Amino acid sequence: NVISTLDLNLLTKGGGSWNVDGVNMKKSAVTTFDGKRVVKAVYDKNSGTSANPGVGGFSFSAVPDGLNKNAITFAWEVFYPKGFDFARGGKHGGTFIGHGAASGYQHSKTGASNRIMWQEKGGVIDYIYPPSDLKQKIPGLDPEGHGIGFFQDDFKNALKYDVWNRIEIGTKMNTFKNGIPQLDGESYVIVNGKKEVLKRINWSRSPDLLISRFDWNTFFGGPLPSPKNQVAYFTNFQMKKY
Numbered sequence: 001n002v003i004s005t006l007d008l009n010l011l012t013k014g015g016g017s018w019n020v021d022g023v024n025m026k027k028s029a030v031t032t033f034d035g036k037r038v039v040k041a042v043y044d045k046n047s048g049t050s051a052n053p054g055v056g057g058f059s060f061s062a063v064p065d066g067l068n069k070n071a072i073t074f075a076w077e078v079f080y081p082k083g084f085d086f087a088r089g090g091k092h093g094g095t096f097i098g099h100g101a102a103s104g105y106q107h108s109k110t111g112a113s114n115r116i117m118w119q120e121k122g123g124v125i126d127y128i129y130p131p132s133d134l135k136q137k138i139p140g141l142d143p144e145g146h147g148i149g150f151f152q153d154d155f156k157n158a159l160k161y162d163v164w165n166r167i168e169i170g171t172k173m174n175t176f177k178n179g180i181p182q183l184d185g186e187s188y189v190i191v192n193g194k195k196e197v198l199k200r201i202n203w204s205r206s207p208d209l210l211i212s213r214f215d216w217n218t219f220f221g222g223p224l225p226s227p228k229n230q231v232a233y234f235t236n237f238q239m240k241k242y
């Protein structure tokens, strides 16, 4: 079900068919590790958001050829060396819907996002920013404050040390009936083969606002930055059928 795979040797020169831009490698770099072509994600002590002075992580945006605007999954693998301190969470990346803000305490009427976060002790959650001024029925899915977490009980200590963890995040748009969003959008998260699904989401307010891009932006927190200088390795970035 893999549609295409990102060539990391093209990450900083347009990404090939992935149509990559918005790149900020920061202190991170494409390299070889464990016989694989990887990004070594460098997270300085006291790095996290712009509130934190350390440099950590890396970011890029992709609009790959073959991006199905109605439903799509993105997948990657991550290696955490033994001793990595996961702190109280951080971001990997995910799918953005529509246009406008949908991250960093900013919401917009036209935009939304579906992202993977890690958690304490290697937990994983689905982390969603829903659009402003759009009905939801899922409890707690409000476009106020920061993003809304799901599957907290479901992936405790799912990310293991000294192994390639496999992560996937699936996003499927709601339908529309006479331009009215139908509260039937979906999200799923897969970590090392275990899948959890969230249904009944309003991902956007109109049928023109659909899945728009893959946004990668890995960093600690907020609000707690990296406790120490440390690294993780990311590889095998895939775009897959929902």
Ligand SMILES: O=C(O)[C@H]1O[C@@H](O)[C@H](O)[C@@H](O)[C@@H]1O
Pocket: 088, 089, 090, 117, 119, 125, 146, 147, 148, 149, 150, 152, 222, 223
């Ligand atoms: O408040 C939420 O839904 C989530 O917010 C994130 O920032 C936290 O890392 C996570 O532990 C929460 O469950």
